[PDB]
UniProtKB/Swiss-Prot annotation, chain A:
ATP-dependent serine protease that mediates the selective degradation of misfolded, unassembled or oxidatively damaged polypeptides as well as certain short-lived regulatory proteins in the mitochondrial matrix. Endogenous substrates include mitochondrial steroidogenic acute regulatory (StAR) protein, DELE1, helicase Twinkle (TWNK) and the large ribosomal subunit protein MRPL32/bL32m. MRPL32/bL32m is protected from degradation by LONP1 when it is bound to a nucleic acid (RNA), but TWNK is not. May also have a chaperone function in the assembly of inner membrane protein complexes. ATP binds at G15, P16, P17, G18, V19, G20, K21, T22. Belongs to the peptidase S16 family. Disulfide bonds: none annotated. Homohexamer. Organized in a ring with a central cavity. The ATP-binding and proteolytic domains (AP-domain) form a hexameric chamber, while the N-terminal domain is arranged as a trimer of dimers. DNA and RNA binding is stimulated by substrate and inhibited by ATP binding. Interacts with TWNK and mitochondrial DNA polymerase subunit POLG. The Lon N-terminal domains are crucial for the overall structure of the protein, maintaining it in a conformation allowing its proper functioning. The AP-domain (ATP-binding and proteolytic domains) has a closed-ring conformation in the presence of AMP-PNP and its N-terminal entry gate appears closed. Upon ADP binding, it switches to a lock-washer conformation and its N-terminal gate opens. The chain holds residues 509 to 558 of 959 of the full protein. Duodenum, heart, lung and liver, but not thymus. It is linked to CODAS syndrome: A rare syndrome characterized by the combination of cerebral, ocular, dental, auricular, and skeletal features. These include developmental delay, craniofacial anomalies, cataracts, ptosis, median nasal groove, delayed tooth eruption, hearing loss, short stature, delayed epiphyseal ossification, metaphyseal hip dysplasia, and vertebral coronal clefts. It comes from the Eukaryota. This is Lon protease homolog, mitochondrial. It is found in: Mitochondrion matrix.
From Swiss-Prot, chain B:
The lineage of its organism: Eukaryota, Metazoa, Chordata, Craniata, Vertebrata. The Lon N-terminal domains are crucial for the overall structure of the protein, maintaining it in a conformation allowing its proper functioning. ATP-dependent serine protease that mediates the selective degradation of misfolded, unassembled or oxidatively damaged polypeptides as well as certain short-lived regulatory proteins in the mitochondrial matrix. Endogenous substrates include mitochondrial steroidogenic acute regulatory (StAR) protein, DELE1, helicase Twinkle (TWNK) and the large ribosomal subunit protein MRPL32/bL32m. MRPL32/bL32m is protected from degradation by LONP1 when it is bound to a nucleic acid (RNA), but TWNK is not. May also have a chaperone function in the assembly of inner membrane protein complexes. Belongs to the peptidase S16 family. It is found in: Mitochondrion matrix. It is linked to CODAS syndrome: A rare syndrome characterized by the combination of cerebral, ocular, dental, auricular, and skeletal features. These include developmental delay, craniofacial anomalies, cataracts, ptosis, median nasal groove, delayed tooth eruption, hearing loss, short stature, delayed epiphyseal ossification, metaphyseal hip dysplasia, and vertebral coronal clefts. The chain holds residues 659 to 709 of 959 of the full protein. Disulfide bonds: none annotated. This is Lon protease homolog, mitochondrial. Homohexamer. Organized in a ring with a central cavity. The ATP-binding and proteolytic domains (AP-domain) form a hexameric chamber, while the N-terminal domain is arranged as a trimer of dimers. DNA and RNA binding is stimulated by substrate and inhibited by ATP binding. Interacts with TWNK and mitochondrial DNA polymerase subunit POLG. Duodenum, heart, lung and liver, but not thymus.
Amino acid sequence: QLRGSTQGKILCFYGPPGVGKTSIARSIARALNREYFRFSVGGMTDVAEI
Amino acid sequence: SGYVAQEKLAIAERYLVPQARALCGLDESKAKLSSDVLTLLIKQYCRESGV
Ligand SMILES: Nc1ncnc2c1ncn2[C@@H]1O[C@H](COP(=O)(O)OP(=O)(O)O)[C@@H](O)[C@H]1O
């Protein structure tokens, strides 16, 4: 909001599963007005998916 | 190699603090960071060969 243009950024969250992690993402999405989307990467081994 | 503890001071005073300052867009007028504060940082919160 201060330095003009939008920038991306990375973050991480951690704790017990089912703590409400995922919910805050969409809540953010409601805050920032950008489109939401999610996808699993657990257990993936091959790189073609990424 | 890695980087010497003292050497990192000379790093952060020139090649690091201004860069992040330009990422946040601030000036020392609103964001001064002395050398001594930096030596305190590395002295306490971060002793790692990478910066
Ligand atoms: N602070 C919170 N506010 C609202 N819902 C919460 C909160 N903490 C936990 N939840 C509840 O936890 C459950 C799991 O949340 P979610 O983050 O979507 O799954 P996961 O924990 O697997 O990411 C949801 O039903 C959610 O309502």
